[PDB]
Structure formats: structure tokens, C-alpha cells
Paper text:
Given that the resolution of 4.6 Å is not sufficient to build an atomic model, we wanted to improve the resolution of our reconstruction. To this end, we performed masking and three-dimensional (3D) classification on the N-terminal two-thirds of KIFBP to obtain a higher-resolution structure at 3.8 Å. Our atomic model provides a high-confidence positioning of KIFBP residues, allowing us to map the structure onto the KIFBP sequence, confirming α-helical positions, and showing the locations of loops connecting HPs throughout the structure. We determined a near-atomic structure of KIFBP corresponding to ~40 of 72 kDa, using this reconstruction for de novo model building. This places the KIFBP reconstruction and model among the smallest–molecular weight macromolecules to be built de novo by cryo-EM.
KIFBP interacts directly with the motor head of Kinesin-2 (KIF3A), Kinesin-3 (KIF1A, KIF1B, KIF1C, KIF13B, and KIF14), Kinesin-8 (KIF18A), and Kinesin-12 (KIF15) family members, resulting in inhibition of motor-microtubule binding both in vitro and in cells. We show that KIFBP is a tandem repeat protein constructed of nine helix pairs that assemble into a solenoid-like structure. Collectively, our work describes the molecular mechanism of KIFBP-mediated inhibition of KIF15 and KIF18A via binding to and stabilizing a conformation of the kinesin motor head that is incompatible with microtubule binding.
Residue numbers in the entry: 5 to 22, 32 to 54, 86 to 107, 111 to 128, 135 to 173, 203 to 282, 301 to 329, 389 to 405
The structure:
Amino acid sequence: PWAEVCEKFQAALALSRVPYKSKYSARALLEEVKALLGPAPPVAQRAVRLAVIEFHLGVNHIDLSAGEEHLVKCLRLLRRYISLCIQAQNNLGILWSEREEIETAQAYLESSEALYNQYMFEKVYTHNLYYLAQVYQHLEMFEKAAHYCHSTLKRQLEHNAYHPIEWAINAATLSQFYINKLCFMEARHCLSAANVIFGQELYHQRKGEIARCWIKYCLTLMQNAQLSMFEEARELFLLGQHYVFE
């Protein structure tokens, strides 16, 4: 019996990879597998095997609020007794945020981070680290959001994957934070680095934001000089990018 349920599971997993191309025959997973796991008879293994199936059924059954009930009882089963709980908890966090109840959604995200640090996967660690930076933006804790944002852009750089529009936009907008805190010698670094990755419709207007960032940089620094009371190199540079801006 074990050989055939393994094949049925693998068939269902392959199916999930596909007018609608969805739902069809996917429900076979539930009836085919539960038909065997039911009479499972340490037997604790049955709890782990059920949790895996319940996880997939919960996520798949999203297309639907009923999916929440499936995810909760999975975590309940696991918590009452090695990385699955983390994968599932992140999903409940996002769900509630999308439902505009971010006051409580943050409770899941912050908990998952503390668990990782204290208790101890690597492939998915950066997801909650990215998402946590976002909810802080709605709570307007600007210093904390800026901190996490930087951490993800740097850590992301280790792993080979890179993108042309992701980095050019995000690295650019971060610079605005340091301009507001009058960091003349630090903000320069961000725009310079962003231009290099970019060098490696959507494909045309993507560049428009970069032009605007350099203009604000140049003007803010010069005007600072008028607080008191041979320098034109900064003015010619500004114009040199102004034509591109226009």
C-alpha cells in the first residue's frame, strides 16, 4: 500500500505545478491519502504525516476563508508536541495583513524571527525579514523600517540571483532617508552603487526615477550653503543629468 500512495502524492504534487488550469483533480489528494492515513495504526509519525497533508490542503484550498481553519489546526497539532511550523505561520501573518488587521499580523512575523534566532530553512529566512519591514511602514516607525530594508538588500547580494528593476528602484528610494538626516557623505554611496547593477514601457521608464533622485541630491546640498550670510562643477553635473530627466 505504501508504494501506491507515494505515487499518488507525487502525481498530485506534479499536478499542482500547472481556461483555468486549476482545481481540476487536485481534490484527489485529500480523498486518496486520507483513505490510508486514517487507519494509521511511536505512532507520533502519523501526526507529522497528517500535518504535511493538512498544510498542502490549507494552502491549496485558498482558491476562500475556510483555508484559515485548515492552517490553524495544523499548527495546533504541531505546537502541542522541524521547520514546517515556520513555513505555515508566515502564511497566517500575510493573510491577516491582507485583511487589514495588521495590528495582529505583526505578532506572527516577529514571533517567527525570535524563534529562528533563539532556537537555532535558510532558503526561506529572508521572506519574513522582508515582509516585517513593510508592516513597520504603516505603523510609521521609520527608523526601524529603514534598518531592516538595508539588511535585506545586503544579505540578498550573497546568493547568485539578481534583478534589474528590483535593485534599481529599492536602493534608490532608500537614499531619501539619509538626505532627510543631512548625511551628505553617506547618501552618495547609495545612488552610485545602484547605477552599476542597473547597467547589468517597463524597460524604458524604469530609469525615470533615477534621474529624479540625482536632481534632489544636487539641489539639497547646494541650498544648505545659503544658511550663512568657483563652485559650478556641481551645476554642470546637475544639468548633465537634467536632459536625461527631460
